[PDB]
C-alpha cells in the first residue's frame, strides 16, 4: 500500500491553485507502475518520493497521465510542501532529472504552508510565428516581444495592454494546437502585480491554474523588457477565469546574460489524504 | 579569406571544455586544403561549414590534423553553437557523412549558449581483451562489463569503484597503444552524476577533455547495466585531471534492443575569433 496526499500548489485555500498528488515511500514501484498510477489519478501530475541517489533529501519523479517530466514547477512545490510534513529541516533538496532543486520551507506550528525553489535557468528566443499566434488568440499585436522560453517545458509570452483585455481573450484552441511542445502564456499588469492565463493543447491543458514553470521565465521577460528590474519580485495571479486562482511569486537575479538565480515561491495547502491498495 | 571561431565545447567558461576551430563559408576550399588548414591549426578537430546538399541547413566536414572523420561529438556541438550565431532558427540540421544530425539550439539574448544533438545509435560488444586492458590501466578488475561501442569512433568503457580510484589511475600509455582504432574511457559515479577520463593513443590523445561521442554510449552502458534507466539523463564530468573540465549531458531512450534516441547536450563558449589569409 502507499499513502498519498493531494496538495493544491500556489494556494492557501483548498480548491484554489493547482492540484498535485504526492505518493510517499515509492521505492517499491517500478516506473511503469508509477505511470499507471498517474493515469489512474488523472491529475495534471502525480509525484513519487524515492530515496536519494546523489546526496539530496529525496529523489522525485514527476508524471503526467501519459509521460514522465524532467521538471515541473507546481508539482515540485506541492511535493516539497507535502514532504515537509515529514521532516523538521528548513531547506529540502529534491533530486530530479534536471539535477537537485533547492527548496526553502516555511512553517507555522510545524505545518509547511509555503516554499521557495531555485528553478533551472531558462533560455529563450523570438517565437517567429507572431501573426499565426496572434490570429489564434484573437488579437492584433502583443505589447512586448513574443518570446519562447525553455526550462524543460517551453513557454511563450504574449502581452496584453490591460487585465480586462486579458480576461476578454477567447482563443481558438484548435488554431493553438499547431503550436507543439509549448504553452501560451498571456499576461498583463504593472509594477509588482501581474495577471496570467495559460493555454496549451500540446501539454493537454485547455486553461491552466498555475503554470509554475512559467513564473520564472515571466520575471525574466518583464526584467529584460524594462517593466521590473532584475532582483525585484513580482506577484503573478493566474487561473482566475477558471476559478482556480493561483498566486506565484517570482524573481530573476543577475542580468539577462548572466542570471544567477530564478526564484519561484508560493503557498500550498492539503486538499486530501489517502491510501492506495498497491 | 575565411573567418573562423574557436569554440570550447562542453563548457560555459573559456579554457574549459574541448576546443574546436569552426571555419565559415568554406565552399571555395577543396578537401585537401581543408586538411592542410586542420594541420595548421593543430586542434583536435577543425570543422568547415559548407552549403547543404540534402535539405539540411549546412554540410559540416570534420578534420583532425591528419584525417577526415565521419562523426565527432564535441566538434559538431561546437559547430552548431558557432553557427547559431548566424541563424535565428531554433533547430539546426547539420549534414555529415553519417547523415543529418539534428541540433536544438539554446540562446540567451541571441547568443547560443548550449545545444543538444541526436547522435547516431551505437553498437557494442564485449572487448574480449580484459586482462591486457586492465594491466595497461594498472588495476585488477572493472566494476561493469568491459564493452566496446561503435558510433563512428569506438569507445571502450572500464568502470572504477569510486571517483578517487578513477583520479588515481596512471595508465601505461605504451601498453594502451596496442588498442587500435578506439578510445579507453574510464568512469565512476552514481545516480545522475558520473566522472570520466579518456585515453587514446590510437586517436592521438594522451587524455581527452570531452569525448562527446562517448557520452551517448556511456548512458547506454549505464542503463544496460542497471545504474540508471533508459530515458534518464546523466551528467558526465570529464577532463578534470587535465584542467579542461567538460560537462556532457546524455540520455538513451528506448531499450537496449530498440534504442530510439541517443541525446547528448552541453554548453559552449567562444574562446576566440579570427580570419585566415586563404
UniProtKB/Swiss-Prot annotation, chains A, B:
SUPFAM superfamilies: Diaminopimelate epimerase-like. Pathway: Antibiotic biosynthesis; phenazine biosynthesis. GO terms for cellular component: cytoplasm. GO terms for molecular function: trans-2,3-dihydro-3-hydroxy-anthranilate isomerase activity. It is an enzyme of class 5 (isomerase). The active site is at residue 45. Keywords: Antibiotic biosynthesis, Isomerase, Virulence. Pfam families: PhzC-PhzF. It comes from the Bacteria. The keyword Isomerase applies. Its EC number is 5.3.3.17. It catalyses: (5S,6S)-6-amino-5-hydroxycyclohexa-1,3-diene-1-carboxyate = (1R,6S)-6-amino-5-oxocyclohex-2-ene-1-carboxylate. The keyword Isomerase applies. Homodimer. Belongs to the PhzF family. Isomerase that catalyzes the condensation of two molecules of trans-2,3-dihydro-3-hydroxyanthranilic acid (DHHA) into the phenazine ring system. The final product is not yet known. This is Trans-2,3-dihydro-3-hydroxyanthranilate isomerase. It comes from Pseudomonas fluorescens.
Amino acid at each position: 500500500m502507499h499513502n498519498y496526499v493531494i496538495i493544491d500548489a500556489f494556494a492557501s485555500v483548498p480548491l484554489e491553485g493547482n492540484p498535485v498528488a504526492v505518493f510517499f515511500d515509492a521505492d517499491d514501484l517500478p516506473p511503469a507502475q508509477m505511470q499507471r498510477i498517474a493515469r489512474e489519478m488523472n491529475l495534471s501530475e502525480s509525484t513519487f518520493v524515492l530515496k536519494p541517489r546523489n546526496g539530496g533529501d529525496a529523489l522525485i519523479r514527476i508524471f503526467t497521465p501519459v509521460n514522465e517530466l524532467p521538471f515541473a514547477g507546481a508539482p515540485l512545490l506541492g511535493t516539497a510542501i507535502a514532504l515537509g510534513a515529514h521532516t523538521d529541516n528548513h531547506r529540502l533538496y529534491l533530486e530530479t532529472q534536471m539535477g537537485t532543486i533547492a527548496f526553502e520551507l516555511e512553517r507555522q506550528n510545524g505545518s509547511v504552508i509555503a516554499a521557495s525553489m531555485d528553478q533551472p535557468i531558462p533560455t529563450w528566443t523570438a517565437l517567429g510565428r507572431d501573426a499565426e499566434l496572434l490570429k489564434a488568440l484573437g488579437i492584433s499585436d502583443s505589447t512586448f516581444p513574443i518570446e519562447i522560453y525553455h526550462n524543460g517545458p517551453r513557454h511563450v509570452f504574449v502581452g496584453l495592454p490591460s487585465i480586462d483585455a486579458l480576461s476578454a481573450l477567447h482563443p481558438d484552441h484548435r488554431a493553438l494546437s499547431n503550436f507543439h511542445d509549448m504553452a501560451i502564456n498571456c499576461f498583463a499588469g504593472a509594477g509588482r502585480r501581474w495577471r496570467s492565463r495559460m493555454f496549451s493543447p500540446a501539454y493537454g491543458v485547455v486553461e491552466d491554474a498555475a503554470t509554475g514553470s512559467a513564473a520564472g521565465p515571466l520575471a525574466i521577460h518583464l526584467a529584460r523588457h524594462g517593466q521590473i528590474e532584475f532582483g525585484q519580485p513580482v506577484e503573478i495571479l493566474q487561473g482566475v477565469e477558471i476559478g482556480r486562482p493561483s498566486l506565484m511569486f517570482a524573481k530573476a537575479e543577475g542580468r539577462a546574460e548572466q542570471l544567477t538565480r530564478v526564484e519561484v515561491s508560493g503557498n500550498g495547502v492539503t486538499f486530501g489524504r489517502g491510501t492506495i491498495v498497491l
